[PDB]
């Protein structure tokens, strides 16, 4: 077999990116300032964190074993519980004490045959008393919200119709449905999209099979009262390339950014309309809604080039690190229109941004608040001379949060400081009676000065000021998505506005 | 109640001394070099590590909750398990989410009444299939060697005759007895010493009550074939001072360093002879043995002033930090002599030293190898300009290990580097046929450059060279004592030579 390294090497595991790989508990975290005593619930987040050194040199960040953090809040006290998802990969590599899974989404490079290749490392959501650890090439892994025990690969009582489950399901705050899909839904390189939903009782509702015009990456999607929307990243899969040891994904400069629109209820596959947006990168969806005219307003991060630059086109053509900016775009779609080409979107702010969150009490409906990561290159905001040598590589950089009020157009910016970077934030309603976007924001900080992580608590009344700074004595590696589960919500999801 | 701080403050919890307070697992630790594949067993060590900020300002290092590390070795792979001892203090403070136990060994400063005040933070030994977590003011806490679960306070099947159990019991490699004592054995300020032993079947053998000439600290003791030896540190307890909120311990410049000698088997309390060594500090015992003439050779660290300078005399007189050196002393004692005063000891090396270990296969018998911590002020050995600002306070410093061959007088020195310090080492016999002092030495390093801990593996053939350096991504706070439990030893202790 290819030799197993016994320590981490390369930029993707250097400095703040060095795996810690700890599982367990740190109770009664140190707090500077004061955590509001009324906050009760759990912040769950997932990070890719390789458990064993890869036999693949410069293995991408996206290929690391999913490690779940829970921050349990009550009466102004907070405890950390941390545990790896027991994926097939994790368990078999732990048994062998060496890496066995090969390149990102390329089973032809694996040293043994895997049934499930999930690292379960992208999102961690709450559904019917379980956590679901998500990776878009796989079904979810079900976990205990209290102990972070892994129950195992989850098939929704045998109802899961798809080999794949999106990392970005939407929770309808009115119907209490989980709205889902999977792409490559019949295996590697398939153009099959399976759109499916679960009612609050756990019974499957929608199941529609449709066909993508290309085998393109559909990372995120949008849900409105009457439509589901599938934006396709112009990364394209060729299985014959994979069989020769090549990348699952390859940029295609020659195709539009396709945006599929399907009726949400009772549709057949042929009802999808593949609208054609100007060529670009489909970032994360903030939210979508139908306006008075019945037009879909799709608000999402949008770049004009390949954000995933490490997967360039067939001729190795693509941007360099830190070159590509994504902007907060609004696309207008009319399902009734027979005109497939779409106009350039309007932009809601100027900031280089990503990781948009809304008040999920208005998810699938008109929202007027968005919280998002920003990356400001303006001199002094980040001390790059100090941070870059300590940062390692492979992960996106955010040096603040912004709150956009969509009605007033007012923007507040949180800057943690010149030697700190942020992850994706969560929003917490102040209480069950709170107005949209009124309450608390939490975000994990990388402190390059201490080489420690911190959890910031902000009040939406003034996003510039930390109400509390929770000081971890370890690093939590830069991660991906996370969610708030409020103690006052019996089903784990907030009540509609 | 006195207010509970919500973050650590003061020098004793700054820099490398900042509590981490993690419990759980890090498997498959990163290794530079190669762990010898034949090493099979577990290195257990204990550190004081406050679980909650103290309401006592500048609480000494010795007062922190005991946290147990196990390093489990097999086939050149190593896993860390880490867990706090569930002392009465730990459990009640965890339930309250605040500190309740007050000053070191002063129950009159506690915010609630404790039955047991142990932090179980000084030593961690193996006895008849359990770990015993030791603190000289208390009985042991019994723990599971595999899971580090705490069973609870241990009374040896109801046989424990003493309120107190030394942190330095001796294991007779021939008789397989655990030889023990406790001082202040009938409560705070009592001069009662209880000498007691357990046979390998767990049955109590010796129990002798004797009387100390002063209520002095007896931290360590020595055992030979026919004698047990009690060196008294001139720190003295006055319970009336403690009732007013004063220190348990106060230096007395006016007394000798008493060295009690008692027949090991069948003695009465009145058989003890209190020899009087020149005034000084009784450090850790390397080992004691009877020579041809039946004279006790007692080899131990010995200083001429108060090493525990934070507990000065009645007028606040004593040394400053880093002023007092301890030296590797040999005392000669003849139980038959009626002459109480003892000559100044001979010194085996010139190094400022402590934490002596021998090959425990010759414990209580003639030894010819000692491994010990050294602190070398020779310019360049430690980069003090870099280290001191990052070190915090309250813990002793060691910047190397030395191996003394007692026959040849040859000394090898291990220097981890100018920005690293060491803990107490362990010795591992190469195999059951190995000569005395032949095998492996392990020692935990504090790396002030990375602010991480490392576990060094040395071969006794050349102590100057690391065979392996195990790289922890977290800090293990400077700790106290530790022990090797070899897989090849059914009772957890090595076979006699
Ligand atoms: Cl599990
Ligand atoms: Cl326990
Ligand atoms: Fe995502
Ligand atoms: Fe000791």
């Amino acid at each position: 077999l290819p030799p197993a390294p016994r320590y981490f090497q390369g930029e993707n595991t250097a400095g703040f990116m060095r795996p810690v790989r700890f599982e367990g508990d740190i109770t009664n975290l140190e707090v500077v300032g004061e955590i509001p005593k009324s906050i009760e619930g759990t912040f769950y987040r997932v990070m890719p964190e390789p458990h064993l050194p890869s036999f693949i040199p410069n293995d991408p960040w996206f290929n690391g074993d999913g490690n779940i953090s829970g921050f349990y809040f009550k009466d102004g006290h907070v405890d950390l519980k941390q545990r790896y998802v027991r994926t097939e990969k994790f368990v078999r590599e732990a048994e062998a004490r060496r890496s066995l899974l090969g390149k990102y989404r390329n089973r032809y490079t694996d040293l043994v045959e895997f049934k499930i290749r999930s690292t379960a490392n992208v999102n961690i959501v709450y559904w019917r008393g379980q956590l679901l650890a998500l990776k878009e090439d796989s079904p979810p892994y079900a976990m205990d919200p209290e102990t972070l025990e892994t129950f195992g690969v989850y098939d929704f009582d045998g109802q899961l119709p798809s080999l794949t489950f999106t990392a970005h399901p939407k929770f309808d705050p009115v119907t209490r449905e989980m709205v889902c899909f999977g792409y490559e839904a019949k295996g590697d390189g398939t153009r099959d999209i399976c759109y499916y939903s679960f009612g609050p009782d756990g019974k499957i509702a929608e199941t529609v099979w449709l066909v993508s015009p290309v085998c393109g990456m559909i990372h995120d999607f949008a849900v409105t009262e009457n439509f589901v929307i599938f934006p396709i990243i112009p990364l394209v899969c060729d299985v014959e390339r994979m069989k020769q040891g090549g990348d699952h994904w390859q940029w295609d400069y020659s195709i539009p950014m396709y945006i599929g629109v399907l009726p949400r209820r009772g549709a057949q596959g042929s009802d999808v309309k593949w609208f054609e947006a100007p060529h670009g990168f489909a970032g994360h969806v903030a939210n979508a809604f139908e306006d008075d005219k019945g037009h879909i307003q799709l608000q999402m991060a949008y770049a004009k080039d390949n954000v995933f630059f490490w997967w360039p086109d067939a001729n190795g053509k693509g941007p360099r690190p830190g070159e590509v900016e994504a902007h907060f775009a609004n696309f207008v779609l009319d399902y009734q229109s027979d005109k497939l080409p779409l106009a350039e979107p309007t932009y809601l702010v100027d900031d280089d941004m990503e990781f948009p969150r809304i008040d999920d009490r208005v998810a699938t409906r008109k929202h007027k608040h968005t919280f998002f990561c920003i990356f400001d290159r303006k001199p002094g905001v980040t001390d790059f001379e100090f941070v870059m040598p300590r940062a390692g590589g492979g992960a996106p950089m955010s040096n603040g949060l912004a709150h956009l009020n969509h009605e007033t157009g007012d923007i507040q910016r949180y800057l943690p400081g010149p030697r700190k970077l942020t992850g994706e934030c969560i929003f917490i309603p102040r209480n069950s009676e709170a107005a949209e976007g009124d309450g608390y924001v939490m975000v994990l900080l990388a402190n390059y000065e201490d080489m420690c992580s911190e959890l910031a608590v902000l009040d939406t009344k003034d996003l510039t000021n930390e109400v509390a700074l929770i000081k971890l004595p370890v690093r939590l590696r830069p991660g991906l998505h996370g969610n708030w589960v409020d103690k006052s919500d019996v089903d784990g999801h907030p009540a509609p506005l």
Side-chain angles (χ1 to χ4, degrees), chain A residues 1-338 340-497:
Chain A
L1 293 179
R6 289 298 296 279
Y7 61 100
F8 291 100
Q9 297 178 307
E11 300 307 344
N12 283 2
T13 58
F16 210 94
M17 293 298 287
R18 186 193 167 189
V20 177
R21 307 183 299 109
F22 99 81
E23 306 194 285
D25 299 280
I26 315 182
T27 64
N28 297 290
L29 299 176
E30 300 188 73
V31 180
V32 175
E34 202 192 331
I35 301 168
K37 280 213 228 300
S38 60
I39 295 171
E40 195 180 4
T42 310
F43 175 31
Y44 297 103
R45 53 89 75 176
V46 57
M47 56 180 169
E49 190 175 42
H51 194 226
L52 293 157
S54 184
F55 65 89
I56 305 299
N58 302 325
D59 205 5
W61 179 55
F62 288 171
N63 214 25
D65 294 306
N67 200 347
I68 310 303
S69 299
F71 296 93
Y72 301 72
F73 287 85
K74 176 161 198 204
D75 297 329
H77 297 279
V78 58
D79 302 333
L80 170 63
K81 190 177 292 288
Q82 186 85 54
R83 202 169 155 80
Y84 276 112
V85 188
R86 259 57 187 182
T87 65
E88 183 181 332
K89 169 188 192 297
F90 183 91
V91 168
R92 293 178 71 176
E93 291 182 349
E95 265 295 327
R97 290 186 178 276
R98 62 152 301 148
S99 45
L100 297 172
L101 190 128
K103 290 185 61 176
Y104 182 80
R105 292 199 67 167
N106 191 345
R107 73 188 68 252
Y108 300 101
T109 65
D110 294 342
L111 299 185
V112 303
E113 186 172 350
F114 289 95
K115 265 204 68 182
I116 304 290
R117 292 185 85 264
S118 194
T119 48
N121 66 350
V122 176
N123 202 359
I124 184 72
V125 299
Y126 192 96
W127 180 244
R128 297 186 66 252
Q130 301 184 300
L131 301 184
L132 300 180
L134 305 187
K135 178 68 159 199
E136 70 203 46
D137 66 354
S138 297
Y141 273 83
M143 307 178 80
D144 190 305
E146 177 178 50
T147 67
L148 299 187
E149 175 192 0
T150 301
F151 297 127
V153 64
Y154 190 59
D155 66 13
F156 295 82
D157 306 307
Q159 299 176 102
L160 181 61
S162 181
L163 297 184
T164 62
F165 186 105
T166 184
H168 291 290
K170 309 299 171 188
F171 299 93
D172 187 320
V174 175
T175 68
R176 315 308 292 177
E177 294 169 305
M178 191 170 58
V179 195
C180 317
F181 77 100
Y183 77 91
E184 290 189 51
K186 295 189 173 166
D188 288 341
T190 62
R191 292 192 291 123
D192 301 287
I193 299 162
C194 190
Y195 160 59
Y196 54 98
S197 66
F198 297 96
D201 63 353
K203 286 302 148 71
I204 199 153
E206 295 295 318
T207 295
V208 182
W209 290 94
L210 49 147
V211 174
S212 197
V214 299
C215 185
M217 176 189 283
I218 313 177
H219 180 61
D220 204 345
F221 88 137
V223 180
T224 70
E225 190 174 319
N226 298 295
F227 298 104
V228 296
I229 301 102
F230 306 100
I232 311 190
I233 301 163
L235 286 167
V236 177
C237 179
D238 176 2
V239 175
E240 295 302 316
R241 181 179 63 240
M242 289 164 55
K243 284 172 178 162
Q244 306 271 45
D247 294 336
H248 188 105
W249 293 124
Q250 186 182 91
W251 193 258
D252 191 335
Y253 279 110
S254 86
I255 63 175
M257 180 175 82
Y258 291 107
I259 306 183
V261 180
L262 183 80
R264 180 168 167 184
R265 299 184 198 276
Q268 311 163 328
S270 50
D271 294 332
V272 69
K273 285 209 179 70
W274 292 107
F275 294 98
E276 302 184 1
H279 176 84
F281 196 91
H284 289 106
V285 175
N287 188 48
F289 62 93
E290 292 157 48
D291 63 12
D292 299 321
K293 317 152 200 191
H295 292 171
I296 299 160
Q297 306 290 320
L298 172 60
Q299 311 200 331
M300 63 184 293
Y302 176 71
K304 297 308 293 187
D305 214 341
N306 182 8
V307 170
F308 302 166
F309 52 83
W310 55 87
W311 296 319
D313 85 353
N315 302 310
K317 175 195 174 183
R320 284 173 324 280
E323 172 182 328
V324 184
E325 298 187 12
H327 298 297
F328 195 8
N330 184 92
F331 291 90
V332 182
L333 300 101
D334 178 6
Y335 179 68
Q336 302 311 329
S337 178
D338 284 321
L340 293 187
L342 292 178
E344 290 277 359
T346 55
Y347 295 105
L348 298 173
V349 301
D350 296 343
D351 307 71
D352 183 17
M353 55 82 65
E354 246 293 349
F355 292 106
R357 307 305 296 270
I358 61 152
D359 184 335
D360 285 327
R361 293 182 294 168
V362 296
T364 78
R365 300 291 169 89
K366 176 65 178 299
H367 69 281
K368 60 167 159 166
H369 297 276
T370 308
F371 309 87
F372 50 86
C373 293
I374 58 173
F375 187 47
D376 197 347
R377 275 165 262 256
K378 167 212 181 206
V381 176
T382 300
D383 180 0
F384 290 113
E385 196 192 344
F386 184 89
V387 169
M388 289 311 96
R390 293 170 173 75
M397 294 202 166
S398 163
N399 57 10
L401 293 181
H403 171 207
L404 174 66
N405 186 321
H406 292 233
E407 279 188 358
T408 75
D410 293 343
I411 305 168
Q412 297 178 93
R413 295 190 172 76
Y414 169 62
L415 308 191
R419 296 172 172 193
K420 299 183 188 190
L421 299 178
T422 88
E424 178 195 64
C425 78
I426 48 152
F427 168 75
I428 306 167
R430 198 175 301 279
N431 55 64
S432 52
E433 307 302 295
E436 189 187 332
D438 181 53
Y440 310 101
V441 170
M442 297 193 185
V443 64
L444 197 70
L445 307 184
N447 186 342
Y448 294 90
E449 206 145 41
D450 294 348
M451 300 298 287
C452 288
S453 295
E454 303 165 344
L455 183 56
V457 184
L458 318 174
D459 193 313
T460 59
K461 287 194 233 275
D462 181 14
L463 212 75
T464 71
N465 172 63
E466 296 150 359
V467 170
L469 196 53
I470 302 155
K471 313 280 266 183
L472 309 190
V474 301
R475 292 180 293 99
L476 296 186
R477 206 167 184 251
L480 284 166
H481 300 284
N483 291 282
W484 181 253
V485 181
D486 201 276
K487 204 68 189 304
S488 76
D489 299 325
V490 174
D491 74 358
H493 292 273
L497 263 193

